[PDB]
Amino acid sequence: GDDELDQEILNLSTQELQTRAKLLDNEIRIFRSELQRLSHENNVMLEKIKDNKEKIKNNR
């Protein structure tokens, strides 16, 4: 957090800092969608290797 502290009282208003974290709330609600999107794909992928390897060990 190199911002939203007494460094940034100088740069812009203290009310800009009040609202700025609340524009970072939208932004992490979006990064959470994408991170959970990627949770579901790594759960499906790993199980798709299990499907492959199960035949492969039988032949092996």
Next chain:
Amino acid sequence: TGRDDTKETVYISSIALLKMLKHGRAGVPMEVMGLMLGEFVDDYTVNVVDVFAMPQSGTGVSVEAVDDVFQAKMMDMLKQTGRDQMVVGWYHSHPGFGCWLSSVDVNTQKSFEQLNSRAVAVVVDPIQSVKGKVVI
């Protein structure tokens, strides 16, 4: 009186026959197998409406190479398409040898006979079906 067992004749629908041949020749000489979906009506008619293939192994047929997990998924696929009825047995393909059950195959068959007594085993010879006769 007990239960009396008597003649039956296995009627292989045109669909079922092509699938066994296709799956069996393609996988030969590795053993091929699959379940027979159909219905029993009558007491002289085993009617095999369809077959499918269960995944091949390089352990060939085995009691644990039948694989019920795969059977269950497949059954639900037919259920959603409105084609499930009753599994009437199993078939397997010996490669270029005759139709006879192997000792191992007897025990594979003993399992399905518990689940339905009218279950058959259908032994296929694909490399011998390229005559003017199909050997099954």
Next chain:
Amino acid sequence: MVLEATVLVIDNSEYSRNGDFPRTRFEAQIDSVEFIFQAKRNSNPENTVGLISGAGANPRVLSTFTAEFGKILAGLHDTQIEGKLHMATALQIAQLTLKHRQNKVQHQRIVAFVCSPISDSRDELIRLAKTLKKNNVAVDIINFGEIEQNTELLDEFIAAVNNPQEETSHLLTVTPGPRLLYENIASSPIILEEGSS
């Protein structure tokens, strides 16, 4: 309500690239879906959610009924926004998706986001409105498309659907002004809704 299957219709448009809502409407709808899934699932985890779009020049199934939260989410990653929702056909395509369910105990419900003024005919859609309830389908219309200066064809659609039936049609209009689309919809009765039997 409990014991319920829901097809959410997402309106895909260039109207949802508008920044009225945060920080387009589409990016607001991503958040909204995630919330809705959990609300229903924690009311009763035998509920399932399907997802269709308007995307394309014809609606399409991005997800059939699934108990998988991530499949709905994956569907949104796939969908494209240059398509336009055509509501008449989307209702009919939803009705078919609502015949297929995990269990048949799950009730039938449509939830429809509106982000564009609808230019399908009123009399055309009034037939469809009455088809829904014969199939026992009620429809909750979240409206924020037909309030960008447009009439309420909707008023007639919701009255036609309502009847003695535990599935109950609802008209919700969501404040278009910044208060966060998802917040208001989540806070709005959706698991505190009532029947009409």
